[PDB]
């Protein structure tokens, strides 16, 4: 067989509890699957609309907050300031609730995208939370794509309130 039976199914932690996440996060070398998500004006935005640019897919359970860690904002700012790069902050919050994201608002080349339309992205990117109070939301993950949509960095955070490795994601773009 050409598959790994010993790689355990994706599990993340929330409130000290193991939570299942459907699918498999794309790994370095994989070709990222095309997706369509919803922007702040309710228009549909396809991954193909960013052809040639490097993409930082910064995936969150929710970005609907009035207070955030400086590191969240700093990573989005730094990545968005790099040449030929777009940061896509993705969550299940509706576009009406994403505009007040403490870590994305007013940042150059940082776009918020909603899972409102459609959930095929969640399965394709292995970020769908399927158990507990968070079921229906996306897990916390970072996926960096080069100019040709090849994965150059991938991280599914073990604990949902834990920050991903921002230095490693940025290093992949250098």
Binding site for its own copies (CB under 8 A): 38, 41-43, 62, 64-65, 92-94, 96-97, 116-118, 133-137
Three-state SS letters, 24-79: CCCCCCCECCCCEEECCCCCEEEHHHHCCCEEEEEECCCCCCCCCCHHHHHHHHHH
Catalytic residue among 28, 68, 119, 168: 68
Active-site residue 68, yes or no?
yes
Closest approach, Cβ 103 to its own copies, in A, equals 15
- Sheet of strand 17-22: strand arrangement: 11-14, 17-22, 128-129
Closest approach, Cβ 41 to its own copies, in A, equals 8
Closest approach, Cβ 116 to its own copies, in A, equals 4
Residue number, 14 or 153, with CB nearest to its own copies: 14
Residue number, 79 or 137, with CB nearest to its own copies: 137
> Cα separation of 170 and 174, whole Å?
7
Residue number, 43 or 108, with CB nearest to its own copies: 43
> Cα separation of 117 and 47, whole Å?
13
Catalytic residue IDs: 68
């Amino acid at each position: 067989q050409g598959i790994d039976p010993f790689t355990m199914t994706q599990t993340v932690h929330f409130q000290g509890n193991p939570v299942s996440v459907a699918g498999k996060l794309p790994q370095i070398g994989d070709k990222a699957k095309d997706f369509t998500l919803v922007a702040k004006d309710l228009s549909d935005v396809a991954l193909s609309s960013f052809a040639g640019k490097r993409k930082v897919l910064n995936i969150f359970p929710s970005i609907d907050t009035g207070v955030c860690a400086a590191s969240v904002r700093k990573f989005n700012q730094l990545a968005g300031e790099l040449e030929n790069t777009v940061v896509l902050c993705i969550s299940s919050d509706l576009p009406f609730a994403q505009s007040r994201f403490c870590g994305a608002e007013g940042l150059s080349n940082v776009i918020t995208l909603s899972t409102l339309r459609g959930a095929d992205f969640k399965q394709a990117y292995g970020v769908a939370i399927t158990e507990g109070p968070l079921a229906g939301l996306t897990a916390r993950a970072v996926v960096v794509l080069d100019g040709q949509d090849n994965v150059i960095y991938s991280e599914l955070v073990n604990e949902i309130t834990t920050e991903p490795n921002y230095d490693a994601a940025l290093a992949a773009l250098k």
